[PDB]
Amino acid sequence: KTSALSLSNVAGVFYILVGGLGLAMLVALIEFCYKSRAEAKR
């Protein structure tokens, strides 16, 4: 019959999304650690 989508059938796109958000925060923090350390020298 005509079945409705379940979270199992789409959870894959949910793991990439959360992975992207974690990666984006990591990228932002790394640029923060670089500028913060550089500012101390200057």
Partner: protein, 49 residues
Amino acid sequence: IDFSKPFMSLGISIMIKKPQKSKPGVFSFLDPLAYEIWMCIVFAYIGVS
């Protein structure tokens, strides 16, 4: 006995139990996605923002 001309047409038929089917309500445009996907979309929307 001696019957009379058919005053009504019958015929064997197979009765069963009626497989009741849900009746789409007003909020039936949400049927394609299970409510657990809609719940997670809201959480994803909050998390992404």
